[PDB]
Design a protein around this ligand. Structure first.
Ligand SMILES: [Mn+2]
Ligand SMILES: [Mn+2]
Length: 430
DNA sequence: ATTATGACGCT
DNA sequence: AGCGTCATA
């Protein structure tokens, strides 16, 4: 245990915007503020599909992946904002641009890894070292942590939520050894001070509220972020992990929400993350492979080494559209019209990207789905991307897929297409 | 008939 | 390269 690496070398934060597309719409339209509201795409089919939900609306049981007509049954006064439509399809440009606003603010504090349209990881290790020296070994005042929860506290020997939060924070700060500049708990605490500042800057400069997690790695930071949403941040210390994990369903951990997580549970006969500690690393590797087993063995002990990648920008720019049920594309001209629609939005986004970010895509991926099939994608073919023009891209896309047509006559398309996807990839500096 | 994305791992 | 998994609004 002298040599037992603690996995406490880094301070990592995860910042995630609260109900993000909803906040974007509420900033634009003040009538939606502090109301049960949701963001919907399309409208004809069952009122449209919900993709974001305000906390007021979640109180009524409204969720994402709910049809708006069904959501209105739970919440009759639900207000709805519609995703823009351009060239016959949902267009997410407003939310992508809002995301850039937030990411550029975070980048003033540290290197960030864009993890989704509305969240980024922050490696704060260096910022913390600097703030620690600025500090002088003064105590950290509760006043510097006005929206911070310390997971696991208060504990040991009032019934208000904010009262509980301060109780826990006071116990944490009372215990801290601010004397030691290499203390991991102290380092997390200064990390949280910086994230309060970052979150204040995001709200001041965009109007958007967010939550955050602070811990020693990405998985714990992501988990921490969720603990006290909305508009709060949570510090998960190395020490808080045994109790936290002792009743944490395995599926709650990032990457375990799917088939792998289900196989951990079934094969091992366990339910909670903490139960993993009873297996040897070799045992876990035998069941889940070398990489996953090593990852699980360390992760259940609160340790993970995945770095925060310095990447603020998406690696791919894609445009996709489903043609569900009876709207499936059964005609050549239909297929070519929609490929052009997709290609025109792609050209628009690619040109904007080239101007803002000094880079050019070099590969065009074309993906389709066929009726009665499978899975999200039936077939994925790549071809060169040499020019940002929609007509070339759409013609090229048709070329690589046109032989998928089992149809006897080339005017018809069989079996009908239920999805088209164009994705630009393999960016190079330009 | 959730839809529209976007990253990463496997072979 | 093409496929599959996991994730987010
Ligand atoms: Mn969010
Ligand atoms: Mn998110």
């Amino acid at each position: 245990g002298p040599h037992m690496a603690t996995g406490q070398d880094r301070v990592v934060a995860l910042v995630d915007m609260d109900c993000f597309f909803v906040q974007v719409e509420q900033r634009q339209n003040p009538h939606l503020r502090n109301k049960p509201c949701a963001v919907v795409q399309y409208k004809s089919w069952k009122g449209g599909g919900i993709i974001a939900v305000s906390y007021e609306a979640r109180a009524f049981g409204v969720t994402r992946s709910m049809w708006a007509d069904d959501a209105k049954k739970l919440c009759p006064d639900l207000l709805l904002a519609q995703v823009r439509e351009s060239r016959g399809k949902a267009n997410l440009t407003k939310y992508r641009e809002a995301s850039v606003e937030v990411m550029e603010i975070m980048s003033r504090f540290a290197v960030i890894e864009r993890a989704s349209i509305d969240e980024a990881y922050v490696d704060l290790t260096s910022a913390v070292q600097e703030r620690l020296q600025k500090l002088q070994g003064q105590p950290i005042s509760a006043d510097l942590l006005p929206s911070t929860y310390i997971e696991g506290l208060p504990q040991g020997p009032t019934v208000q939520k904010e009262g509980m939060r301060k109780q826990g924070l006071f116990q944490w700060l009372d215990s801290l050894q601010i004397d030691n500049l290499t203390s991991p708990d102290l380092q997390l605490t200064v990390g949280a001070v910086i994230v309060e500042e970052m979150r204040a800057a995001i709200e001041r400069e965009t109007g958007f509220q967010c939550s955050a997690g602070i811990s020693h790695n990405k998985v714990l930071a992501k988990l921490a972020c969720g603990l006290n949403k909305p508009n709060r941040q949570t510090l998960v210390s190395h020490g808080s992990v045994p109790q936290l994990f002792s009743q944490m369903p395995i599926r709650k951990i990032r990457s375990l929400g799917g088939k792998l997580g289900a196989s951990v549970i079934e094969i091992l006969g366990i339910e909670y993350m903490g139960e993993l500690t009873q297996f040897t690393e070799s045992q876990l590797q035998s069941h889940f492979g070398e990489k996953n087993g090593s990852w699980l063995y360390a992760m259940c002990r609160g340790i993970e080494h995945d770095p925060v990648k310095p990447r603020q920008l998406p690696k791919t720019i894609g445009c996709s559209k489903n043609f569900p049920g009876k709207t499936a594309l059964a005609t050549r001209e239909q297929v070519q019209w929609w490929l052009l629609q997709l290609a025109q939005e792609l050209e628009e986004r690619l040109t904007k990207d080239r101007n803002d970010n000094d880079r050019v895509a070099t590969q065009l991926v074309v993906s389709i789905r066929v009726q009665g099939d499978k899975r999200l994608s039936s077939l994925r073919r790549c071809c060169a991307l040499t020019r940002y023009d929609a007509h070339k891209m759409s013609h090229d896309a048709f070329t690589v897929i046109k032989n998928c047509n089992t149809s006897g006559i080339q005017t018809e398309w069989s079996p009908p297409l239920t999805m088209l996807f164009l994705c630009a990839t393999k960016f190079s500096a330009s």
